[PDB]
Amino acid sequence: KSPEELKGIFEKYAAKEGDPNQLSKEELKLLLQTEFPSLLKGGSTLDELFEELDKNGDGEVSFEEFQVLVKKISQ
């Protein structure tokens, strides 16, 4: 999906919890389950993936640091 579509997705799942800008594990899980069910395991198991994506180290994943996932996809 284009970065734009991925933004749309990011917003969808983020907003589904409430926070528009930042995904928790659950938003990621549902996101991944719907759009990329492999990636729940693939590359890294969800919990580890979350840490890997959360470069800023707050816990929850912003659209910017979420680009690490898109990088992984590109790889």
Swiss-Prot record:
Residue positions binding Ca(2+) 1: Q22, E27
Keyword Repeat in annotation: yes
Binding residues for Ca(2+) 2: D54, N56, D58, E60, E65
Pfam families in alphabetical order: EF-hand_1 (PF00036), S_100 (PF01023)
Keywords: Acetylation, Calcium, Metal-binding, Phosphoprotein, Repeat, Vitamin D
A molecular-function term among this protein's GO annotations: calcium ion binding
Modified residues (Phosphoserine): S38
PROSITE patterns assigned: EF_HAND_1, EF_HAND_2, S100_CABP
One Gene Ontology CC term in the entry: basolateral plasma membrane
Stretches assigned to the EF-hand domain: 9-44, 41-75
InterPro entries according to UniProt: EF-hand-dom_pair (IPR011992), EF_Hand_1_Ca_BS (IPR018247), EF_hand_dom (IPR002048), S100/CaBP7/8-like_CS (IPR001751), S100_Ca-bd_sub (IPR013787)
Protein name per the record: Protein S100-G
